[PDB]
Design a protein around this ligand. Structure first.
Ligand SMILES: *[C@@H]1O[C@H](CO)[C@@H](O)[C@H](O)[C@H]1NC(C)=O
Ligand SMILES: *[C@@H]1O[C@H](CO)[C@@H](O)[C@H](O)[C@H]1NC(C)=O
Ligand SMILES: *[C@@H]1O[C@H](CO)[C@@H](O)[C@H](O)[C@H]1NC(C)=O
Lengths: 23, 23
C-alpha cells in the first residue's frame, strides 16, 4: 500500500539492515 | 529442490531486491 488510505498513522524509518550488509 | 521433481511448475523469473542495491 501507499500512505494515502490508513486511518491512523506515524512516521519512522524501517531499517532494512541489508544496506549495512551491502556496504 | 530441483525443478524436475515438482509437477506443473512454470518457467519464470524471480527478482531479488538486494542485487540492484549492491550493483
Ligand atoms: C483517534 O484515533 C485516530 C486514529 O484512528 C487518531 O488519528 C486521532 O488522533 C484519535 N483522536 C482522538 C480524539 O482520540
Ligand atoms: C493440465 O491440464 C492439461 C489439459 O490439457 C494437461 O495437458 C496437462 O498435462 C495438465 N498438467 C499437469 C498434469 O501438470
Ligand atoms: C522451461 O520449461 C521446460 C519444460 O519442458 C524445460 O525443458 C526448460 O529447461 C525450462 N527452461 C529453463 C530451465 O530455462
Amino acid at each position: 500500500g501507499n500512505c494515502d488510505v490508513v486511518i491512523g498513522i506515524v512516521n519512522n524509518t524501517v531499517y532494512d539492515p541489508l544496506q549495512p550488509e551491502l556496504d
